[PDB]
Amino acid sequence: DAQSFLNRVCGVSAARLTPCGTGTSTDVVYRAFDIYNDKVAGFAKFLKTNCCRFQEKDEDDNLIDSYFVVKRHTFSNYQHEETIYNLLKDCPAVAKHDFFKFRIDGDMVPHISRQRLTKYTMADLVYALRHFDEGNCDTLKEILVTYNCCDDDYFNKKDWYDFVENPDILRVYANLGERVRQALLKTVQFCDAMRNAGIVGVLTLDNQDLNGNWYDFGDFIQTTPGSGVPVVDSYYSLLMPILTLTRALTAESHVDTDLTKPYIK
Ligand SMILES: Nc1ncnc2c1ncn2[C@@H]1O[C@H](COP(=O)(O)OP(=O)(O)O)[C@@H](O)[C@H]1O
Ligand SMILES: [Mg+2]
């Protein structure tokens, strides 16, 4: 049933979930992976299929930007991800997981659930700002709207995207800046939580939702604690043109790095 499954996914975290999928079946969505393995490589828009997605709604039944991705995979990967998460649990930049085994049809399929991710990961912001195409920019309108950079009528302007006819677009993009900068800070906590726990892995962009949290421990192998390494070659590098389109460091010219406080003199 898709109702006992929902009442399991809600868990102990008192959240009210509307299934974006349909009937305990995975929701196939078109996303922006950054991937390298023995067959494929690149920063490309693939199509992910292994994740049931439920959206949480607040009081008065309004949908907020907070989802519950419930990725289902093999039992061995579930066990490995459970031990890696129980090492990295104490970190604050790690989205809260929930590991359960549920009767899907006649068998216990192991689901690992991730709580309160946003809709689009950082790779979707970076891909939609790096691979711009003004006919088809719908994961940039939705990111700009849903994080209050503009107000969904800004796109009724004739050329809202144009840096030379509409220079005000820079003020729009800079309103993403503090959402990006906090993301950077959360990475440096997560990298630290890897280094002090002895976990070796590759930080990709698409494993970080736009709040900042990190949520994929599939190919992290653990070594002796105090000596793990994070590999952030292709995290910081793909992200790099976004750190000045969106002016991510203009909260650093303010005293004690708070956007409310006055400038440093
Ligand atoms: N064929 C598959 N079906 C489902 N899950 C898989 C498959 N191959 C790998 N995985 C697991 O999913 C991860 C990649 O899934 P992905 O689509 O990136 O979702 P997420 O970003 O949540 O990991 C890998 O780390 C691995 O643990
Ligand atoms: Mg992943």
Side-chain angles (χ1 to χ4, degrees):
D1 190 24
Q3 182 45 54
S4 294
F5 183 65
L6 211 158
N7 279 125
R8 184 53 195 91
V9 164
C10 170
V12 316
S13 163
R16 314 207 270 116
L17 305 187
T18 89
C20 271
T22 156
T24 182
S25 174
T26 79
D27 165 69
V28 169
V29 73
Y30 202 73
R31 292 277 182 256
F33 289 83
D34 151 53
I35 182 165
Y36 176 81
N37 39 21
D38 307 62
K39 44 166 171 297
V40 80
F43 196 19
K45 237 177 165 67
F46 294 89
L47 172 131
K48 72 191 298 275
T49 58
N50 57 339
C51 296
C52 318
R53 289 153 41 85
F54 308 95
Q55 181 177 41
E56 177 198 31
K57 53 177 186 303
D58 70 331
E59 228 66 36
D60 205 75
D61 285 0
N62 298 332
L63 295 322
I64 28 178
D65 202 44
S66 78
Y67 293 73
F68 279 66
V69 176
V70 208
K71 150 189 163 185
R72 52 182 81 177
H73 197 206
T74 357
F75 185 84
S76 62
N77 175 83
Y78 156 89
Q79 275 188 341
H80 163 261
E81 212 153 347
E82 196 184 13
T83 73
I84 289 295
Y85 171 67
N86 282 7
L87 261 53
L88 285 166
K89 188 198 309 173
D90 328 302
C91 186
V94 169
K96 171 174 175 50
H97 290 16
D98 178 30
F99 296 89
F100 58 93
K101 302 177 65 50
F102 199 63
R103 171 91 55 189
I104 277 300
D105 282 358
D107 45 333
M108 301 307 189
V109 185
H111 304 70
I112 137 184
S113 134
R114 291 90 75 111
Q115 299 193 337
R116 304 181 214 275
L117 310 166
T118 57
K119 185 184 188 183
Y120 295 111
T121 52
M122 287 271 292
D124 267 292
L125 165 69
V126 177
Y127 185 80
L129 261 177
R130 263 173 144 254
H131 288 54
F132 193 69
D133 183 15
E134 88 272 12
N136 182 40
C137 43
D138 290 322
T139 66
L140 186 67
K141 287 172 187 165
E142 190 161 355
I143 283 179
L144 290 185
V145 158
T146 207
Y147 298 126
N148 292 343
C149 311
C150 52
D151 51 348
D152 199 15
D153 292 353
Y154 195 88
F155 311 136
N156 288 326
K157 200 171 303 199
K158 37 204 308 299
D159 43 0
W160 61 273
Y161 34 72
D162 205 337
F163 286 119
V164 296
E165 303 273 357
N166 181 29
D168 171 79
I169 193 58
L170 287 162
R171 174 208 66 86
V172 167
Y173 283 150
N175 288 12
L176 276 165
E178 197 70 14
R179 190 148 279 263
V180 166
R181 186 181 80 92
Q182 297 291 329
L184 281 181
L185 287 181
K186 296 236 193 177
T187 280
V188 195
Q189 302 178 31
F190 188 47
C191 282
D192 274 358
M194 274 161 74
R195 172 78 175 172
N196 306 358
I199 278 175
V200 182
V202 193
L203 298 204
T204 35
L205 267 173
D206 56 295
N207 298 322
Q208 169 163 39
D209 47 328
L210 258 158
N211 295 340
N213 310 347
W214 282 85
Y215 68 96
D216 174 22
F217 310 131
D219 60 297
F220 287 4
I221 55 169
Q222 33 167 356
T223 174
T224 62
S227 97
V229 303
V231 176
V232 292
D233 267 356
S234 61
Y235 176 82
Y236 286 117
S237 170
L238 290 165
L239 185 65
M240 250 184 215
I242 311 304
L243 300 171
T244 15
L245 214 49
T246 68
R247 283 212 296 274
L249 263 63
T250 51
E252 285 269 8
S253 42
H254 295 196
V255 52
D256 285 329
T257 71
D258 195 297
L259 261 174
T260 65
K261 292 209 185 71
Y263 273 32
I264 308 197
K265 290 149 205 313

